[PDB]
Amino acid sequence: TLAFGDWIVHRRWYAGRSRELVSAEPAVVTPLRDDLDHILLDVTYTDGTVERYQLVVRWADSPVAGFGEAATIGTALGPQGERIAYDALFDPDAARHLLRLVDASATVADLRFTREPGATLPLYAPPKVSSAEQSNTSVIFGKDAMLKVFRRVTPGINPDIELNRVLAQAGNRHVARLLGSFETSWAGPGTDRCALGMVTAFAANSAEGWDMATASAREMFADVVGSDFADESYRLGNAVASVHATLAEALGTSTEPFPVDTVLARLQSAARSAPELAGRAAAVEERYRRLDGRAITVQRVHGDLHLGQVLRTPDDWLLIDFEGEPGQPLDERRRPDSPLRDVAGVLRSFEYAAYQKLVELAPEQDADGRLADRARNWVDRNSAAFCAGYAAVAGDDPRRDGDVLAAYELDKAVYEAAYEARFRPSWLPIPMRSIDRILGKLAAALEHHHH
Numbered sequence: 369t370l371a372f373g374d375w376i377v378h379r380r381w382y383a384g385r386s387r388e389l390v391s392a393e394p395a396v397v398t399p400l401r402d403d404l405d406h407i408l409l410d411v412t413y414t415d416g417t418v419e420r421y422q423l424v425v426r427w428a429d430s431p432v433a434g435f436g437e438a439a440t441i442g443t444a445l446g447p448q449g450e451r452i453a454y455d456a457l458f459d460p461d462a463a464r465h466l467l468r469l470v471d472a473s474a475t476v477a478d479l480r481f482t483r484e485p486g487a488t489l490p491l492y493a494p495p496k497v498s499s500a501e502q503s504n505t506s507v508i509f510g511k512d513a514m515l516k517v518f519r520r521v522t523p524g525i526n527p528d529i530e531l532n533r534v535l536a537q538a539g540n541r542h543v544a545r546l547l548g549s550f551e552t553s554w555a556g557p558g559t560d561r562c563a564l565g566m567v568t569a570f571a572a573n574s575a576e577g578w579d580m581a582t583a584s585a586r587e588m589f590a591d592v593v594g595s596d597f598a599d600e601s602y603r604l605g606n607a608v609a610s611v612h613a614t615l616a617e618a619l620g621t622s623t624e625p626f627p628v629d630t631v632l633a634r635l636q637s638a639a640r641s642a643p644e645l646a647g648r649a650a651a652v653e654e655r656y657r658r659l660d661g662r663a664i665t666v667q668r669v670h671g672d673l674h675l676g677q678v679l680r681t682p683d684d685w686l687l688i689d690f691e692g693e694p695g696q697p698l699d700e701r702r703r704p705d706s707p708l709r710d711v712a713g714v715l716r717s718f719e720y721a722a723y724q725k726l727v728e729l730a731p732e733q734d735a736d737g738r739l740a741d742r743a744r745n746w747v748d749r750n751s752a753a754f755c756a757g758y759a760a761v762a763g764d765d766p767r768r769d770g771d772v773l774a775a776y777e778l779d780k781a782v783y784e785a786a787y788e789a790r791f792r793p794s795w796l797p798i799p800m801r802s803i804d805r806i807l808g809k810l811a812a813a814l815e816h817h818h819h
């Protein structure tokens with residue numbers, strides 16, 4: 369036995385928030401080696417809720433040097449005497465062992481590992497745990513592959529694994545290729561599946577779209593917007609449309625009414641967080657209600673798309689992180705949606721990339737608004753390029769259904785406003801400006817005045 373509860377509450381991936389833990393106990397312990405245990409740990413709260421975490425424990429008969437305090441779980445008596453329990457994901461040999469189980473498509477008790485057909489795993493490469501802030505734990509093997517081990521685990525089909533598999537197996541080149549994964553059952557053999565981790569090809573020497581965009585939007589004296597990042601935005605549009613096309617073919621398309629009631633509920637909630645919104649709520653609602661009964665085509669989509677979710681390798685843009693929007697339940701995250709909502713996500717991201725500069729400057733540094741003008745011009749140029757690149761692949765310009773597109777942009781801006789009002793008041797002018805602009809964009813498109 370180990371004092372799991374005392375250890376887990378200090379971990380950055382632990383989501384207990386401000387809650388009292390009743391118990392933290394292993395639901396399932398699966399030996400991998402004589403000194404390596406896979407553990408499904410159930411944390412029970414006072415309201416009776418249970419949240420399950422995945423832990424891999426490396427046992428040692430004496431203090432091992434390389435483990436930090438955060439990787440030290442506890443101590444316990446075993447058959448040969450005292451043992452120390454370490455978080456095995458920080459052990460190179462243990463991480464390699466997991467990768468080997470994936471490589472072999474091994475089954476260990478109720479744990480099912482699978483290597484994607486034809487995939488090669490870098491079993492020789494040095495494993496190093498990612499230092500990047502996240503809710504899971506990732507081990508990078510050399511420059512070749514990333515093993516992501518999920519911390520909080522839940523029942524059902526994992527959309528990140530699911531959609532990456534579809535895309536990779538269809539030969540889509542705009543993903544970091546899924547190389548393998550592993551899972552178990554929720555309540556023993558014969559019950560709901562539970563995804564545990566994934567292995568993906570590591571995109572070495574890549575840049576995040578957000579970093580490239582902000583660099584472009586910060587270039588001094590760039591009053592005449594350049595063509596280089598527009599070229600990149602066009603290529604990114606190609607990539608997003610390509611991903612959408614593969615997903616549409618594999619997982620189908622259908623039609624639904626535009627979700628007026630859903631976006632209205634989000635508006636009502638947002639207006640409680642951002643009082644600034646009440647002055648615009650009537651106008652937003654009118655635009656949404658004009659779409660009542662509008663049929664929209666939906667399909668499986670990325671679901672949380674922005675410039676932080678795309679990587680530029682030396683050869684291509686890749687889309688990563690298909691888990692869906694962080695706050696939604698799994699069934700909702702696997703629902704089809706409009707591809708235009710993904711497009712809207714990128715357009716919002718361009719807006720923030722350009723205007724972050726302005727909210728960080730003092731008023732006196734842009735008294736005549738010329739940097740603001742440049743930001744607007746940069747967003748317009750790159751948004752147009754992105755949409756054109758999308759159109760080149762889709763064979764249909766997202767701006768054609770401009771009313772639906774603008775409504776999704778508006779819904780995102782309303783959500784952003786509520787967020788900034790709560791967490792970052794100085795950023796609130798960004799979505800508020802967007803709302804006024806998009807209100808006009810949407811009004812124009814509803815009258816079919818858009819180009």
Ligand SMILES: Nc1ncnc2c1ncn2[C@@H]1O[C@H](COP(=O)(O)OP(=O)(O)CP(=O)(O)O)[C@@H](O)[C@H]1O
Binds near residue numbers: 502
């Ligand atoms: N295949 C790959 N090759 C190279 N870098 C990758 C990669 N997959 C992810 N990354 C990088 O690793 C980091 C983590 O990416 P990820 O999409 O998991 O962030 P995230 O913020 O969504 C974590 P969480 O969802 O838990 O909050 C990012 O900096 C991302 O650019």
Ligand SMILES: [Mg+2]
Binds near residue numbers: 676677688689
């Ligand atoms: Mg991400």
Ligand SMILES: [Mg+2]
Binds near residue numbers: 689
């Ligand atoms: Mg993520």
